[PDB]
Design an enzyme around this catalytic site. Sequence first.
Site, PDB file in Angstrom:
ATOM      1  N   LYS B 186       0.978  -1.139  -0.099  1.00  0.00           N
ATOM      2  CA  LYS B 186       0.113   0.046  -0.254  1.00  0.00           C
ATOM      3  C   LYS B 186       0.885   1.330   0.066  1.00  0.00           C
ATOM      4  CE  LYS B 186      -3.938   2.103   0.497  1.00  0.00           C
ATOM      5  NZ  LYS B 186      -4.860   2.511  -0.752  1.00  0.00           N
ATOM      6  N   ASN B 190       1.122   4.287  -2.477  1.00  0.00           N
ATOM      7  CA  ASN B 190       0.719   5.612  -2.326  1.00  0.00           C
ATOM      8  C   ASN B 190       2.030   6.482  -2.399  1.00  0.00           C
ATOM      9  OD1 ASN B 190      -1.060   4.641   0.710  1.00  0.00           O
ATOM     10  ND2 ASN B 190      -1.854   5.644  -0.953  1.00  0.00           N
TER      11      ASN B 190
END
Lengths: 309, 309
Positions: B186, B190
């Site tokens: 993740k 990001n």
Amino acid sequence: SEFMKIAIAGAGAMGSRFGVKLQEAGNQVTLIDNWSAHVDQINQAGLTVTTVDHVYTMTAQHPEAVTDQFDLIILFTKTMQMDAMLQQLAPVLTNHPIVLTLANGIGNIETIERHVPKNQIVVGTTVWSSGLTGPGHITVTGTGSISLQAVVPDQFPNLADLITTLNAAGLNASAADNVLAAIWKKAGLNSVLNTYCTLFDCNIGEFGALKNWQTLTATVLDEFQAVADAAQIQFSAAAVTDLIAAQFPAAVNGNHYPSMHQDMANQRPTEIDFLNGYVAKLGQQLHVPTPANALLTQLIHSQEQLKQI
Amino acid sequence: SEFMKIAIAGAGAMGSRFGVKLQEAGNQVTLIDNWSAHVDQINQAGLTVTTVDHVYTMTAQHPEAVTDQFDLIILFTKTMQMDAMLQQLAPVLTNHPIVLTLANGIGNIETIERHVPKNQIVVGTTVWSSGLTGPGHITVTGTGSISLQAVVPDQFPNLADLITTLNAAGLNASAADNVLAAIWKKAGLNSVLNTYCTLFDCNIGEFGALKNWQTLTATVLDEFQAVADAAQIQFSAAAVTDLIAAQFPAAVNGNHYPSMHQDMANQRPTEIDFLNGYVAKLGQQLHVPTPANALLTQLIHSQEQLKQI
């Protein structure tokens, strides 16, 4: 015996001033340029120089129309437009003229080498100034000088003769061994201010007011230094850094948006491939890592695409 | 015997949903949060959950006011605000509670380690969803699960008991060995979309439409891969790249400006030091070069300064 037939390739403010001085001194000059209104104005009404307005009869042509040949080509074309100019002059080049490049850019030698033997190449810097007021109209102040460095000194004949011709025209030319160094110095400045100002949409003073300007500057310049070291070109990150910081005050360039920022704002392709991109190109060839400069180049290209929509 | 006294540290949408479910299942819950209107609304009128409106009596406090101690702290505080939250709970921590962090960020373990023994730390991911409608009001849809990984498995007692407590509350928790990997996955997404969209002032679809999105993505992710490799955390630049590209269509996130772009537009300090900046911090410690991520971090910080003027 100092006589030359001379082409000025890129007849903007500087080329036009050099061309006038060269012709008035007795040489045969052709101004070569892509700007139709400029070429037409020169050919139809003469070149106007303002110091008081003086009008000169000159010869100007588009590159594709040139069939004459010359003793000397003086190149003022920007690095990014240089290749196309040289392509369009391909027939002009077969007598192997001297090619003196006075353009900014670390990529100019490599570019010219694709079109002419490298021992014909001379690099120069100049502090002559000139402004391009309009088509066929320049405004000129002060005096200047030219510093010249043959790319292959051992094989370039008659640098003296070249210097004589320029000095007979009052251009104050000299031989020096630090010219390509001076060219790389200017490139180091430009690869920091143009590039970061464009990325940030900020002017030179705003850049200098950043709390991390020194880190951003060192990231670019330490890579330039490593490349220059491998290329055996004299370079000082510290000196370039001094010159960068000297731009920051309002009295100087603090409220100025640099040329790359203007290109971006007008949706024109920038010269990034001939600045940071060129350091990265050369570093790759020389086994010198240039990750920052490579990345910055990509960021500017993305910005261009987004602006064009 | 599955009973726990539980603090929810960061009682936004997710914390509030977990807290309700935990309390309704029989546990003693304190919601801890800095948002005055939220804390007051919960304490004065209860927490409202919308599925149809259900109102729950709950206990909420500001961190500086907490004197109770707990068996478990569940941390939802964003990485960037985590340290301050943990500082303000310093007296709460002396009984050495389990600290389960469900926040995004590669920097969370290192942060929590400054405040509690590392064998007390569990990391988690969850696919529970929740929206924060307003102070003391969440809207909730669907079901979910939690995956948990003790940071030092050999020294963490009673992961089973922890899982029992959560499952007794219907949270669908399980032990897994790939959670920190999922957290880093993740983070890789990001550190590309948030960061580049902010630099370019563009939305996710515009990024995906760039002719060089893949190069920009690889520049960040190959560094993430090298760092993850040195950290011995499973990571696949290819998989993250797939997940990034899955955001591009309009049907998904093509017209979305990511959270960092919103922070910048609102003149709020971004989480860059906990994203690209954190990969660079860890790479330095691990002797892995991270020049791109270091530079990107600087660019975002400059952008912040310019926006704040």
